[PDB]
Amino acid sequence: SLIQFETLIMKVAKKSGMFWYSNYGCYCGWGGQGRPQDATDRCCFVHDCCYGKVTGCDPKMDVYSFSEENGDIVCGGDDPCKKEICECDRAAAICFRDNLTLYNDKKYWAFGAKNCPQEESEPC
């Protein structure tokens, strides 16, 4: 669920999703169009595409299971579809953590729709 995605961002990237990734660039926020503007924005774009490929369950609402083990987040449970959602959230949390060197809200927060042209939308 989205609450769990916020939780994974806090655990992995040591940052809040709502404070740092909810309106950054073209894609770190709900939906999106245009080009991923930088490495953090591309992490959100891939997360959108991953969610778009989940068939059978709901990435917003459904609750997945995970454990911390061997220094990593391990997605689990008995449901393949819910584990797919967890994998999308875990990959994006690690992607955020790994691209903190580049993060730049001064340049990219509330980047604006003109800057994210419908015609430049990179396909998944």
**Least Å distance between CB 28 and Ca ion?**
6
What is the contact mask toward ligand PBP in residues 1 to 40, using x (rule: CB under 6 A)?
--------------------xx-----xxx----------
Is 41 a residue that touches Ca ion (CB under 5 A)?
Answer: no
Is residue 88 within 8 A of residue 50, CB to CB? The reply is: yes
Query: Does residue 89 carry a catalytic annotation?
Result: yes
Is 112 labeled as ligand-binding?
no
Count the site residues for Ca ion by CB under 5 A.
3
Could you tell me which residues come within 8 angstroms of residue 16 by beta carbon, excluding any fewer than 6 positions away? 6, 9, 10
